[PDB]
Amino acid sequence: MQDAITAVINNYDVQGKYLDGAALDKLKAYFTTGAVRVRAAAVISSNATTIIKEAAAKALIYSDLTRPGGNMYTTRRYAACIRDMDYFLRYATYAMLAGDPSILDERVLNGLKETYNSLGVPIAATVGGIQAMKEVVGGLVGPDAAKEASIYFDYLSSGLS
């Protein structure tokens, strides 16, 4: 994987160049928002279960998905769906901390679409759940890191769909 800093380092290493002024502005631009990312990550880690519960209540349950014949019918499937939501939330937090979606590409999106197609999981409903989680996280973290958190949720949704 790679964060913003390591991404800049590889981008200059491939050309065999020392760090120049523009690379300096990129690194400084990441460094300027270091504290806000850490604070929002701590907030998300402290409120992990509540975010998932509110997102599920808003977007998944009270639906066909929880009724017999639905995809998240039965306790096993309900637990699997909430586990997938927790997976998405944790990796969104990692991507937000690192300032780069490379971890999302490597550890989440690769083959998840085909696995969901084979299993019959509703990708549209999953992306709706991710969007509800994005709304709740943006509410919790505040304007400071709301957009920066929201970009990686949008990245996950676009990659899944």
């Binding site: 964060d3 390591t6 290493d13 065999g16 400084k28 460094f31 270091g34 990550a41 992990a48």
Partner: protein, 160 residues
Amino acid sequence: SVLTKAIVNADAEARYLSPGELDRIKSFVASGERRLRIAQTLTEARERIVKQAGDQLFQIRPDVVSPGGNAYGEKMTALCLRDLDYYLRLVTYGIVAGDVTPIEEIGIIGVKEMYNSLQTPIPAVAEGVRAMKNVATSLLSGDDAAEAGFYFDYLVGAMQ
């Protein structure tokens, strides 16, 4: 970098980041401008560091520029200086990154086998890196000189 290390360990244990890891991230982001200034100074003085590093290495080990030497010849010494510039660039990368993953993935893993392939003295390369350490610390204040010295000593220890 520190972010990559913390995130990788947290993902490997399948958990959110610990408060200690968050504190190390906070310290790393705090030291960012200082690290950038040190790297800017080194990249500005990249050529002089390389030249006197080569002079110190040749004074210490004239056998390498001897007939049975790996770098015998002007183009062989040019290749030695080019490897020197490569390692200086890697040191600047490590200094800005705050840790040694980029330096590791670029210039130490397999370096033993590569320099065995080229029949080059690894201790001689380490001595050249030490000469670079001296020349670079000669251009920096004490704290920043020590900070660069940590990465230079890491390179020397890795080439071992």
